């Protein structure tokens, strides 16, 4: 018999294999479609979720009641040191799909990227690319490499670039770098290949790939939450207090005839550590790193045009469970997936952006740098010492 009052189903079936992620670094499942008329650029980048803060900004939205009014918006900081490009990979189109045609690695590969090729760096004699590196010092080896590049320009339709993160500049305990294919979009295959050949062994900041007030995509893995029941996993209604064998269940898991359990019923299992692609996260800031100029350590990352302070993006006591942000970073609007210290994939948008919320121009007034390790109430330690005066600690 039919159910009387209609109720929408709990949970999306479009994320259905609710399993632990088989990758830890979020994979770009689909890169932006290439336009040969565009200049040659990168389409993706790899950062690390440092933490969150909140900003104050005036809004220019005609038709809203918040026009010329200042809002406080939640923002997430993603510490993005420059990527080092170490490889060039080409892809040929085939009626069975997109085949990896050829991979060329650079002459020098850092130990951070080398650590990715090992499951145990300590007991290894650390020998990856020690025979491949002889290709770039041999005259016949360059005479094979340049014909491999000629084969890629003749046959490949897609060019991606292998780049790895710089783990030494991060406060993480991890020093093994993350490698990633990043699809080089832009002009022809020949000039697209020449671009990556020149940027081979070189560093790419986040400024060259992304810009201020652009909507990007954040790809990552959800926070792990372990084996969870239906009440926290699929958000079903709790059964009443009088229920005998437990009230945090689903009461009926199916009718008698389909004489199985359907794949659409909520069951207990893994919740979290799920790979996700959230779209249209606005870049509210790209802040530069910690600079050493004139002997001074310039660190006024959070000093806006409305602040005139000298404070950094790092709050009081640093980020909780992360460390410091001494590299260039992306301030994104709102919440992105993952834990602190989780690797995040930043992708250029797959959509065309003609909306006012997408084309909105952002001018930050205030960046909150109070401690998140409690109810911290000062933006800077000079402000804290000015309010309190001398303590016993002198």
């Amino acid at each position: 018999s039919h159910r009387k009052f209609s109720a929408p189903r709990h949970g999306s079936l479009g994320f259905l294999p609710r399993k632990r992620s088989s990758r830890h670094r979020g994979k770009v499942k689909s890169f932006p479609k290439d336009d040969p008329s565009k200049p040659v650029h990168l389409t993706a980048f790899l950062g690390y979720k440092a933490g969150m803060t909140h900003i104050v900004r005036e809004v220019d939205r005609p038709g809203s009641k918040v026009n010329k009014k200042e809002v406080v918006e939640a923002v997430t900081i993603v510490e993005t040191p420059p990527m080092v490009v170490v490889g060039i990979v080409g892809y040929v189109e085939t009626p069975r799909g997109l085949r990896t045609f050829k991979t060329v690695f650079a002459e020098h590969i850092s130990d951070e990227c080398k650590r990715r090729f090992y499951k145990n760096w300590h007991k290894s004699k650390k020998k990856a690319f020690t025979k491949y590196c002889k290709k770039w010092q041999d005259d016949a080896g360059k005479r094979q490499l340049d014909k491999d590049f000629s084969s890629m320009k003749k046959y490949c339709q897609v060019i991606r670039v292998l780049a790895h993160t710089q783990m030494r500049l991060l406060p993480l305990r991890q020093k093994k770098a993350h490698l990633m294919e990043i699809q080089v979009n832009g002009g022809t295959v020949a000039e697209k290949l020449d671009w990556a050949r020149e940027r081979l062994e070189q560093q790419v900041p986040v400024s060259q790939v992304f810009g201020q007030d652009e909507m990007i995509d954040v790809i990552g893995v959800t926070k792990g939450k372990g084996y969870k029941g239906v009440t926290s996993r699929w958000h079903t209604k709790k059964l009443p207090r009088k229920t005998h064998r437990g009230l945090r269940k689903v009461a009926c898991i199916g009718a008698w005839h389909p004489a199985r359990v359907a794949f659409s019923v909520a069951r207990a299992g893994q919740k979290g550590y799920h790979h996700r692609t959230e779209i249209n996260k606005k870049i509210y800031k790209i802040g530069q790193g910690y600079l050493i100029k004139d002997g001074k350590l310039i660190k006024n990352n959070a000093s806006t045009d409305y602040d005139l302070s000298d404070k950094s993006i790092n709050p009081l006591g640093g980020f909780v469970h992360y460390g410091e942000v001494t590299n260039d970073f992306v301030m994104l609007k709102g919440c992105v997936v993952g834990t602190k210290k989780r690797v995040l994939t930043l992708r250029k948008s797959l959509l065309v952006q003609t909306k006012r919320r997408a084309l909105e121009k952002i001018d930050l007034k205030f960046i909150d740098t109070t401690s998140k390790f409690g109810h911290g109430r000062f933006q800077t330690v000079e402000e804290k010492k000015a309010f309190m005066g001398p303590l016993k600690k002198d």
Partner: protein, 139 residues
């Protein structure tokens, strides 16, 4: 929600709803009614088992449980002007009152009474301009 002929250009931002059906709020005007018993809220399509709920500025259907006898045993539209549930303004600032309060209105939006005791939230005041005229203090 409002669906009124007298409307401002910009529509209201979502606030926390602290007044479900069954909530008895203060009647903050001189109609003689002291209580407004909320029996439903305007504009809600709803969901299975979910109570309709109201924040400040949202119009509700309400009976009078205590007051003059010619106001009871019937339903009036009313507009919530104060609430104890803390709601977040778009400035990120959180405001709540110590009392839940509303005023008896009609379909068009005119209060039956002619003066309001206590403050009226800005979310109610700009959305209902005949309420904000008789408000003494605002937000």
């Amino acid at each position: 929600s409002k669906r009124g002929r007298g409307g401002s250009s910009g529509a209201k931002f979502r606030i926390s709803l602290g007044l479900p059906v069954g909530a008895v709020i203060n009647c903050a005007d001189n109609t003689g009614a002291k209580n407004l018993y909320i029996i439903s809220v305007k504009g809600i399509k709803g969901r299975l088992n979910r109570l309709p709920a109201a924040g400040v500025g949202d119009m509700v259907m309400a009976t009078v449980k205590k007051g003059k006898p010619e106001l009871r045993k019937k339903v009036h539209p009313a507009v919530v002007i104060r609430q104890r549930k803390s709601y977040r303004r778009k400035d990120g600032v959180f405001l709540y009152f110590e009392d839940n309060a509303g005023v008896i209105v009609n379909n068009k939006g005119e209060m039956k009474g002619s003066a309001i005791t206590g403050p009226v939230a800005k979310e109610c005041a700009d959305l209902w301009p005949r309420i904000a005229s008789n408000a003494g203090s605002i937000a």
